[PDB]
Amino acid sequence: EERSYILATASTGGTYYPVGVALATLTKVKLTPSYHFSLSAISSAGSGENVKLMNDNEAQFAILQGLYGAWAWAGEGPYAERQNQLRSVSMLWQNVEHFIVRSDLAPTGTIADLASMKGKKFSIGSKNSGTEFSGRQIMKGVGVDPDTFNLAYLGYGGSASALQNGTIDGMNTPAGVPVGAVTQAFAAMGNDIKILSFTDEQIKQANGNYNLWTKFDIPANTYPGVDKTITTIAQPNFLAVRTDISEEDVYQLTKAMYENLAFLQGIHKATKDMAIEKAIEGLPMPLHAGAARYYQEVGIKIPAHLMPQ
Numbered sequence: 001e002e003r004s005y006i007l008a009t010a011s012t013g014g015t016y017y018p019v020g021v022a023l024a025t026l027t028k029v030k031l032t033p034s035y036h037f038s039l040s041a042i043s044s045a046g047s048g049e050n051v052k053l054m055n056d057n058e059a060q061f062a063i064l065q066g067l068y069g070a071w072a073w074a075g076e077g078p079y080a081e082r083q084n085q086l087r088s089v090s091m092l093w094q095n096v097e098h099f100i101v102r103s104d105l106a107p108t109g110t111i112a113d114l115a116s117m118k119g120k121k122f123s124i125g126s127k128n129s130g131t132e133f134s135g136r137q138i139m140k141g142v143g144v145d146p147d148t149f150n151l152a153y154l155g156y157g158g159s160a161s162a163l164q165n166g167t168i169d170g171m172n173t174p175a176g177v178p179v180g181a182v183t184q185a186f187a188a189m190g191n192d193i194k195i196l197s198f199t200d201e202q203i204k205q206a207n208g209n210y211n212l213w214t215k216f217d218i219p220a221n222t223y224p225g226v227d228k229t230i231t232t233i234a235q236p237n238f239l240a241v242r243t244d245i246s247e248e249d250v251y252q253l254t255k256a257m258y259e260n261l262a263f264l265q266g267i268h269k270a271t272k273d274m275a276i277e278k279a280i281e282g283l284p285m286p287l288h289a290g291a292a293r294y295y296q297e298v299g300i301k302i303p304a305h306l307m308p309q
Contacts (some may be wrong), residue, residue: 003037003249008059010046015176015270016063016237017043019092022267023239023257030256030263037249047130048078050240055085060242063092065130066235067137070210070284077133087243087288088306089254091236091281093273096177096216097138098232100163100185101170103194111196111206114144114170122149123159123171134235135172138213141206156181164188176270178222187224197231206233211305214282236282243288250290258294280306 007024010016020041027039039061044050050062051072064072071077072086099111105120106113114122124146125131132153139146152159152168159171160181173181185193195218198206206213216234220227241250257264258279264271276298280287287295289308296302 001036002032003246005037005039005060005245006058007039007041008044008050008053008062009041010044010063012043016046017041018268019270020063022264022271025267026256026260026263027253030260031252035249035252039253051083051086054240054242055083057242060245062240063237064240065095065134065237066212066282066284067134068130069238069240070212073285074209085243086240086285087308088283088285089239089241089250089288089291090257090279091238091274091283093176093237093270094216094234095134095174095237096179096218096232096234097213098173098179098182099170099196100173100182100193101196103192105169106194106196109194109197111138111142111198111202113196114139114142117170118148120149120170121152121168123152123154123162123168125153125172126155127153131172131174134174138206141208142202143205160185163193176273177218182223186226190225195230195232198233203233210284212282212284234282238283240285241288245288247290247293250288251293254291254294258298276300
């Protein structure tokens with residue numbers, strides 16, 4: 001009968017889970033009666049578990065952080081070989097990098113200023129979180145060894161409070177814009193702190209061999225007292241699917257997402273990031289054939305490296 005697919009997300013207290021629920025709901029309300037498949041969201045420990053669940057067919061779809069997808073496709077990071085059972089479908093929202101430091105420690109204003117801050121207290125994120133891993137990945141790319149800082153491993157709220165109390169000099173807090181912890185820090189500290197920017201050369205450095213982070217301009221007036229645009233980088237949180245899932249089902253799913261963006265956005269605001277012209281930006285692994293069919297149908301040019309394989 002009905003093909004009841006499982007969609008893996010992350011903890012029920014974060015953003016992966018409710019965005020996943022929103023996709024699942026879209027399929028059950030708009031697709032199951034006519035097309036006879038559904039997605040149902042399950043919680044998980046996050047991207048690393050999600051790759052294992054997909055590989056074992058306990059899940060057929062998952063929300064993945066871009067970097068985990070890059071590692072999976074390259075056979076790098078925690079992987080020793082390419083994870084060839086995984087393909088991409090769509091960006092769902094953008095993880096925007098926020099490397100924030102005391103302003104008097106930023107002689108250029110750019111991410112290279114982390115190097116002037118060795119030996120100082122810096123919160124790289126929760127231990128073993130996606131945030132720790134993306135912070136380490138970016139810093140290594142711009143040539144700064146994270147372990148030459150005095151690293152603290154604080155969450156988003158803990159980092160903001162430590163910055164406000166003066167017990168750390170910078171923090172790494174990436175997420176969908178606006179990031180609550182960054183709002184709190186600027187609200188309390190104003191322009192005593194600074195979001196570090198990324199030049200075009202630093203964007204290339206952050207990516208290394210990957211095509212994952214792209215230029216992202218934080219709009220003026222996003223954060224208290226920051227009345228100017230800021231150029232940083234962002235990577236996608238994206239929907240992944242097993243290669244053996246029906247092309248027709250993946251096509252109908254991709255089409256329904258882009259024909260019902262307001263439906264998704266009314267369930268969870270993170271999907272306000274979605275747009276047909278941003279659908280494939282920074283995806284770290286090639287598209288499933290069914291998703292590519294939809295994108296070409298509506299006139300999207302797919303880069304060679306994302307064409308189905």
